[PDB]
């Protein structure tokens, strides 16, 4: 070890990211740190709404008898998928909305049951994040051409065991959608927060941004997107107001000279990066410790 630099200050952060102890004079890009405590905003179209529950039950029986072992495998394993039946056919959902809940009815202590992702393009618990399907069917018996989800049982700090599987057939489409739950009156149609960086899922497009009110009367459609595909705005199919969406930490530019940050061009009207003076230029705000008492 020859020398070290802590990535704690603004100049040291830029040095750490540029991965060099000396930084030439110039204008460098930078992004502020994102807030981590993030509210959730949901907007959705009110639709024909019937709802089913894809409930998976797991419980396994430990042989109570002569050998009083605890760090072994259980004797028997019933897995169930609610209204499923092997002799009538694989179970799947026709209603627009549905949820998946995993019930771990294992009674033993220092024990648990779990589910892995397997080779499937989605997890069992992540379907509740407004995922689209055209038809998805579950079955404890194998479905040809489908995906397999291994089931697990875990002793704390001990070798885990596989006790079954779960086969899902999926053909992604826009007919049915998964939701976390039918809520007790709390609306999933318009519930948003404003002027605060939030993680949103607005008309089935998800991301992180800031929602504001607008001034436009755009007549057509309900979602407005950029060429990159990102969500720029949306409309509430009620009054009809337009809203706008913007990332909460847009890039800035830092002016560095003589291995020190002398200024910063900002998108907005504030005194960022510890500078005591900010002025407005025709197309950006600029903050620095200067006094404008200079000629060169």
């Amino acid at each position: 070890i020859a020398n070290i630099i802590y990535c704690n200050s603004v100049i040291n952060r830029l040095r750490c990211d540029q991965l060099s102890f000396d930084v030439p004079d110039g204008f460098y890009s930078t992004s502020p740190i994102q807030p981590v405590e993030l509210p959730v905003s949901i907007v959705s179209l009110p639709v024909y709404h019937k709802h089913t529950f894809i409930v998976l039950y797991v419980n396994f029986e430990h042989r109570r008898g002569p050998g009083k072992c605890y760090n072994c495998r259980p004797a028997v394993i019933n897995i169930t998928l609610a209204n499923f039946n092997e002799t009538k056919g694989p179970l799947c959902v026709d209603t627009s909305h549905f949820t998946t809940q995993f019930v771990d009815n294992v009674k033993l202590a220092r024990w648990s049951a779990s589910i892995n992702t397997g080779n499937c393009p989605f997890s069992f618990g992540k379907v509740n994040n407004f995922v689209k399907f055209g038809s998805v069917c579950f079955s404890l018996k194998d479905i040809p051409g489908g995906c397999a989800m291994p089931i697990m049982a875990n002793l704390v700090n001990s070798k885990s065991h596989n006790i079954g599987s779960l086969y899902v057939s999926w053909s992604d489409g826009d007919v049915i959608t998964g939701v976390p739950k039918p809520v007790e009156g709390v609306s999933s149609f318009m519930n948003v927060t404003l002027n605060k960086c939030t993680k949103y899922n607005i008309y089935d497009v998800s991301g992180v941004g800031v929602i504001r009110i607008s001034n436009d009367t755009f007549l057509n459609g309900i979602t407005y997107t950029s060429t990159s595909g990102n969500l720029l705005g949306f409309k509430d199919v009620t009054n009809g107001t337009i809203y706008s969406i913007t990332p909460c930490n847009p890039p800035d530019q830092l002016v560095v000279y003589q291995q020190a940050v002398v200024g910063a061009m900002l998108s907005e009207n504030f005194t960022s990066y510890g500078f005591s003076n900010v002025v407005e230029m025709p197309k950006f705000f600029y903050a620095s410790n200067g006094t404008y008492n200079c000629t060169d």
Partner: antibody, heavy 124, light 106 residues
Framework: VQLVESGGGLVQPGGSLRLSCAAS????????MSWVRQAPGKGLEWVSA????????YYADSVKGRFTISRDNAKNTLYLQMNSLRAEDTAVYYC????????????????????WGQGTPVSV | IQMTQSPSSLSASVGDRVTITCQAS??????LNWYQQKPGKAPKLLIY???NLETGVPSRFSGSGSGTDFTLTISSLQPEDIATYYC?????????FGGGTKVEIK
């Protein structure tokens, strides 16, 4: 590992209390929890319960209609929101920690507790 | 659902084979646990599944059963025991402990 409680005292019948509990040294959000009490010179009886996800809460028969339970998974806090005390709530409380770690989405069984804090006494 | 612990308190010396029977008022068949209460302390865990020694405690405790007769016993009491013991079942969402027992100085 460290466990601690807060918020015990003396209030009138029918009042309110913010019983609190804090933890450190383990994954708070994945373990089940249950508040258990002990009247002075009496046995121990279960009061309330909560799974790692926090989807559902479980209450005792005599406790029903009086106290409610919640946590905050963001910064390792756990509570009993207390209301409507009668006369016999005088006891010491514990935020006993359930042994089993469970997946963050599952609703699973519970009921065996490893570590207990310092205990917090309350009276009415 | 309840459990009766009897006798309520017994005094014992260094070396005796103390025993407590936790009548769970009905058959639970393995879901139980025990705790150690040295006076003035928060309860600590002793036994779980009515069989498994908590590794924070020395191995000089044991218990077994099948039905309602589930027990807890001491091989040979060591002088610092002088504590209260409580049992509980973990079969049901509505779990109820017992009345307790004691071992006392002698």
């Amino acid at each position: 590992v460290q466990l601690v409680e807060s918020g015990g005292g003396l209030v009138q019948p029918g009042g309110s209390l913010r019983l609190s509990c804090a933890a450190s040294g383990f994954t708070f959000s994945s373990y089940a929890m249950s508040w258990v009490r002990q009247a002075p010179g009496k046995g121990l009886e279960w009061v309330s319960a909560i799974i790692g996800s926090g989807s559902n809460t479980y209450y005792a028969d005599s406790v029903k209609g009086r106290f409610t339970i919640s946590r905050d998974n963001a910064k390792n806090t756990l509570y009993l929101q207390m209301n409507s005390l009668r006369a016999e709530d005088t006891a010491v409380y514990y935020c006993a920690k359930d042994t089993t770690p469970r997946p963050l989405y599952s609703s699973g069984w519970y009921g065996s507790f490893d570590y207990w804090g310092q205990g917090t006494p309350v009276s009415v | 659902i309840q459990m009766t612990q009897s006798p309520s308190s017994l005094s014992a010396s260094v070396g005796d084979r103390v025993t407590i029977t936790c009548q769970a008022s009905q058959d639970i068949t393995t879901y139980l646990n025990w705790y150690q209460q040295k006076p003035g302390k928060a309860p600590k865990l002793l036994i779980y599944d009515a069989s498994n020694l908590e590794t924070g405690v020395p191995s000089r405790f044991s218990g077994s059963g099948s039905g309602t007769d589930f027990t807890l016993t001491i091989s040979s009491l060591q002088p610092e025991d002088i504590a209260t013991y409580y049992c509980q079942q973990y079969d049901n969402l509505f779990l109820t402990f017992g009345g307790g027992t004691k071992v006392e100085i002698k």
